[PDB]
Amino acid sequence: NLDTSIVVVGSPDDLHVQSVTEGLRARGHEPYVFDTQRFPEEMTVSLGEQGASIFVDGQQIARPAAVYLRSLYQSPGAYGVDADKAMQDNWRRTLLAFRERSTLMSAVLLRWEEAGTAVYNSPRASANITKPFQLALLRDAGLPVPRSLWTNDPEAVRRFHAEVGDCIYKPVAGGARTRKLEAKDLEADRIERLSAAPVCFQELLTGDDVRVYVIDDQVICALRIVTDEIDFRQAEERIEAIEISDEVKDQCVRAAKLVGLRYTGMDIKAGADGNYRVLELNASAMFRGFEGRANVDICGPLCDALIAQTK
Amino acid sequence: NLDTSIVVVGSPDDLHVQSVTEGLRARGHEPYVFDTQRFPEEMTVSLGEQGASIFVDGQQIARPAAVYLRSVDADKAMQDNWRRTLLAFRERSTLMSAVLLRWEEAGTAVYNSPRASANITKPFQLALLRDAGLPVPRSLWTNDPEAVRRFHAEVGDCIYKPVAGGARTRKLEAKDLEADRIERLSAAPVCFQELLTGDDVRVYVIDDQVICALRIVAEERIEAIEISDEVKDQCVRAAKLVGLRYTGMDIKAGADGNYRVLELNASAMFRGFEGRANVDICGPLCDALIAQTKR
């Protein structure tokens, strides 16, 4: 009684969940919005021992044709999860609750993929998405990446710096902005803070960031992001659709395949020699800000790829 | 300087790490022990962009032949800044998991690769087993009271396990089906299963070969037994489906004398089973770890 042919996993307050559902309506399809954040209190899930025995809010959903996986909201530290009060109260049972929800929703998603559902970014790819492994998978498969060092050993950092030159540091998994490795950072006082957690040091590439969008082995566009350095009182970001050689396109498609993504917004960056190195493929990339500032359509191709699975 | 051919990931304070190291010593291979509990504060690991640039405490360790994967005080940190602490733990976990994934991609035979976690999600694991033709109990994961009333009405007397695992298995009694009792699961999902009246059996699998099976019948009196080659076949198949190299399975028999797979464990313990039924578990495991080094 509901057309669960296309399912958008995410909170209906997610601007990209909204963008994709609207796109899908304009094409004539009514997506089912699977908001896991309401699992224990305002949703009903029942799984039988058979992969097809899946019942959400009473209705059976054995095999959607396609799924757009915005977020499952597995940890209380994710994007769409306001879990602050609950974590301040009793963080152990809150982590327990999030793990309890995650095992069940991941079961649903994995059952769907097992049934043949085209999951646009299946959770399994998580394994390949771990950065210190992703960059090596790409590098050993022929794609250029920055000279890197993920470490907690200050001596390794000093020798890498002496080998490379200007360096940046950023998180291993993510969660903060990359900064230039300044001399202050190599003083013992603060470089010894690597014993608390490792970080990623990389060669400071001086070119321009390029965000390439890939859907089902085809590049949708390539947006160059430029920081307008002219007026310092109001720095603006100019984003421009640009043409990339077919070599770059095929490399991006190969990378998306390697990691295991259908829809991917991957960040690349050129060096002094003006050649691109792959920085990172995202598992649930955003696209709204890029569409707006660059006057391109990314949501459209995504909705069309999703609808093409139903046929 | 060190072998770094057979690597044991875990703490020296662990009994199972101890057994495995003893069995490898008694067999001729002194293994490298990756005690990741030391990772940030004490030991050091450095990864380069090339998958072989893995350096643990200064010594390059690219591509071991085999890995046995076995495995904090922060309540102050979690109440002062939980977002930051969770991110810090993710930084560490990310680097360690990266080490293991790199080795596996290099050719290393990781005994229980973390990639198996996906296939191990219980509510999906049992569906994988059944949808591939294996005998599994009739099961129901739900937070819907009407679903469990119907499930009970269809299968009969049944039992319920915690969703993710940790507690004992209990029997669903009529008193539990009342509105007051059954409503509890409106936010407390558990797993309901047809009650199997047979005897619980633990079976160990390593590299497509059953090692042993023990009925665990008062004190624990687990005793070794022998099972059909049909069920041996089914067990090794289950382990190849889930993607495990060394698994300790729980299977239970129905009233009809046929076994049903209950659950495979990512890294099952054995020090308590091999002593109580006098069979050798650590032995064949060390034999497999060493066998990988040949090729």
């Binding site: 994007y79 608390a196 | 602490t85």
Partner: peptide, 17 residues
């Protein structure tokens, strides 16, 4: 933390994962 601003917050620097 070496990256002190790791937890400073709706964390948006993790919105694409």
């Amino acid at each position: 933390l070496f990256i002190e601003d790791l937890g400073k917050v709706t964390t948006l620097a993790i919105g694409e994962e």
